[PDB]
Amino acid sequence: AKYVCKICGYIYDEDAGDPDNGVSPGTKFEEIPDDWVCPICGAPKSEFEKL
Numbered sequence: 001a002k003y004v005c006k007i008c009g010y011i012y013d014e015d016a017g018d019p020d021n022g023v024s025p026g027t028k029f030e031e032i033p034d035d036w037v038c039p040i041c042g043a044p045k046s047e048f049e050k051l
């Protein structure tokens with residue numbers, strides 16, 4: 001699934017992950033550490049919406 005950061009428009013794609021910030025491809029959004037934030041704007045996970 002894909003999730004959009006409502007603040008900046010960055011799309012978190014579970015298939016891509018966010019390797020530069022310690023999230024391997026295939027990591028489900030719920031499995032991402034609670035302290036991870038949008039890599040672009042710094043918004044907390046609370047500001048993401050599932051597409």
Ligand SMILES: [Fe+3]
Nearest residue numbers: 005008038041
């Ligand atoms: Fe963002």
